[PDB]
Amino acid sequence: QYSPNTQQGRTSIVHLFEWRWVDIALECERYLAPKGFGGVQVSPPNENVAIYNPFRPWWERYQPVSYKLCTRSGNEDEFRNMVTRCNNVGVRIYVDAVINHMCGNAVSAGTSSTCGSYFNPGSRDFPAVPYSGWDFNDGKCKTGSGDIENYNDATQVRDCRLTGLLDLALEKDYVRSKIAEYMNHLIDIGVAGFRLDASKHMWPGDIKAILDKLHNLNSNWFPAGSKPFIYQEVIDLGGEPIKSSDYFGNGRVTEFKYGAKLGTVIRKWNGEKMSYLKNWGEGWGFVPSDRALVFVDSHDNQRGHGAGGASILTFWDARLYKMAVGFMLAHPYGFTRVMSSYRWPRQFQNGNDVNDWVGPPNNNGVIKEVTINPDTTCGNDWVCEHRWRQIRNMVIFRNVVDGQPFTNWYDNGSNQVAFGRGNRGFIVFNNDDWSFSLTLQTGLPAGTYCDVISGDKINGNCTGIKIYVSDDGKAHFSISNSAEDPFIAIHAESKL
Numbered sequence: 001q002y003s004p005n006t007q008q009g010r011t012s013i014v015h016l017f018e019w020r021w022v023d024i025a026l027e028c029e030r031y032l033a034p035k036g037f038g039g040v041q042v043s044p045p046n047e048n049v050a051i052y053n054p055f056r057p058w059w060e061r062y063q064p065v066s067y068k069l070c071t072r073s074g075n076e077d078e079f080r081n082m083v084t085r086c087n088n089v090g091v092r093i094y095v096d097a098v099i100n101h102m103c104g105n106a107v108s109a110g111t112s113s114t115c116g117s118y119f120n121p122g123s124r125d126f127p128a129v130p131y132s133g134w135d136f137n138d139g140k141c142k143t144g145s146g147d148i149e150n151y152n153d154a155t156q157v158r159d160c161r162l163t164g165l166l167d168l169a170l171e172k173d174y175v176r177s178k179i180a181e182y183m184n185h186l187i188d189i190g191v192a193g194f195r196l197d198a199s200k201h202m203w204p205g206d207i208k209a210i211l212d213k214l215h216n217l218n219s220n221w222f223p224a225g226s227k228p229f230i231y232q233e234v235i236d237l238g239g240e241p242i243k244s245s246d247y248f249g250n251g252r253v254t255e256f257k258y259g260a261k262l263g264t265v266i267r268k269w270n271g272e273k274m275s276y277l278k279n280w281g282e283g284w285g286f287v288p289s290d291r292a293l294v295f296v297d298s299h300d301n302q303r304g305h306g307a308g309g310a311s312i313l314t315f316w317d318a319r320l321y322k323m324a325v326g327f328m329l330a331h332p333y334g335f336t337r338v339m340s341s342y343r344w345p346r347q348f349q350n351g352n353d354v355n356d357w358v359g360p361p362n363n364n365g366v367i368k369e370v371t372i373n374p375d376t377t378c379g380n381d382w383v384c385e386h387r388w389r390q391i392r393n394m395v396i397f398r399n400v401v402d403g404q405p406f407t408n409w410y411d412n413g414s415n416q417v418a419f420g421r422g423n424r425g426f427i428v429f430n431n432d433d434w435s436f437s438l439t440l441q442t443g444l445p446a447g448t449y450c451d452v453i454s455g456d457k458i459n460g461n462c463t464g465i466k467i468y469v470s471d472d473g474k475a476h477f478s479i480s481n482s483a484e485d486p487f488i489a490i491h492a493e494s495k496l
């Protein structure tokens with residue numbers, strides 16, 4: 001469960017949020033594979049409720065109607081096509097598995113689904129699975145409203161409705177089998193793993209019972225005995241009866257404290273400073289590195305819909321965002337997930353964004369295709385952070401330094417820090433309100449290195465800053481607090 005199953009050498013996955021299968025297939029071949037990305041997290045591929053009020057929001061995909069591979073992202077044929085092409089190029093696919101619940105109980109019955117399947121929330125009828133009233137936790141939940149009312153009670157958090165979402169009775173073998181049937185169908189198709197949505201709302205034991213019914217990965221692409229990569233979505237900050245450590249026996253867990261803390265540190269909130277990142281990782285109360293799935297922002301908290309709140313950094317904060325992502329990708333802690341989003345009309349009122357529901361770029365509900373500009377950037381309102389030079393080059397940096405230890409740390413007691421990874425990489429950050437000019441020990445072999453943040457190494461030459469490492473491994477770095485990107489990164493493969 002704990003291994004990503006990525007090709008040797010690729011250390012990151014990217015969340016291509018709301019992308020169409022056909023676009024992902026193309027991206028795998030034209031960019032993801034050549035650039036060294038390990039895999040892709042896809043949006044839920046199963047049929048969901050079609051909400052029109054508000055129009056088509058992104059969260060309608062977390063309200064299942066059936067396990068049919070039929071959504072705004074494409075049909076089953078297109079989905080299978082994407083997995084095959086991506087796998088054939090060495091890029092894995094990770095499915096977002098929404099198995100804790102079905103749609104909201106207040107949703108009207110009918111055929112308002114992405115595939116026309118009929119459903120009736122009121123009577124607990126989902127004939128396309130099929131599921132009936134006997135398959136939900138309505139009789140098990142003890143709250144007066146039937147919804148989760150108090151998170152201090154670990155029992156209702158697992159047996160009651162998350163904001164009204166019909167809760168599946170995961171202790172019943174029938175339900176466990178229907179879910180395994182769905183996941184095994186995907187595994188046999190070729191997916192390498194899953195993101196278990198709302199894992200906190202499920203009993204660790206119920207999850208285990210389901211994982212026990214899962215097949216090994218497709219032997220046409222994976223070595224015999226390969227188990228699917230499992231990362232459970234558990235929002236565990238401090239003070240809750242439920243701990244993410246309770247789920248270690250099933251696979252990895254999302255470390256939401258990672259992005260929240262990095263955000264406040266980079267934003268320099270509450271007296272925090274980058275020099276405190278010296279013991280970043282478990283020393284900060286995070287889960288063990290071999291059980292952590294980390295990220296700066298997620299599709300949820302990038303719009304204030306999740307843990308982290310206001311401190312979370314996103315593409316909206318481009319400058320600080322690139323720095324945070326750079327630090328994450330350079331630091332050895334956990335397995336990294338890169339975010340890829342779309343622009344939406346952010347409309348703040350009394351501190352909250354009233355347009356946080358807006359779905360992907362579309363034409364009358366039809367998701368727009370991802371277009372590639374001449375400068376490798378995207379159009380149609382897709383942000384494509386994974387294509388930003390500073391982020392893409394750090395993705396490669398992580399691959400190059402994979403396995404190298406954390407060393408040669410340096411800090412000015414404020415917001416100017418630096419560190420290297422063995423003798424394959426070195427990175428320097430300047431987040432102070434003054435310039436940084438100093439000679440540091442990089443631990444790298446002598447030579448001329450191209451700064452991969454400001455430029456690239458293109459055929460024996462650098463298109464940006466050049467760093468010169470002397471015989472004793474020392475090198476001079478100059479970063480003004482006015483630089484577009486206040487940090488420099490160089491590695492073994494950026495050496496001239």
Ligand SMILES: *[C@@H]1O[C@H](CO)[C@@H](O)[C@H](O)[C@H]1NC(C)=O
Pocket residue numbers: 459460461
């Ligand atoms: C690098 O660029 C210079 C011109 O600025 C050129 O003279 C030199 O031959 C180039 N080297 C390579 C290896 O392309």
Ligand SMILES: [Ca+2]
Pocket residue numbers: 100157158159160167168201202
């Ligand atoms: Ca539940």
Ligand SMILES: [Cl-]
Pocket residue numbers: 233254298
């Ligand atoms: Cl997540």
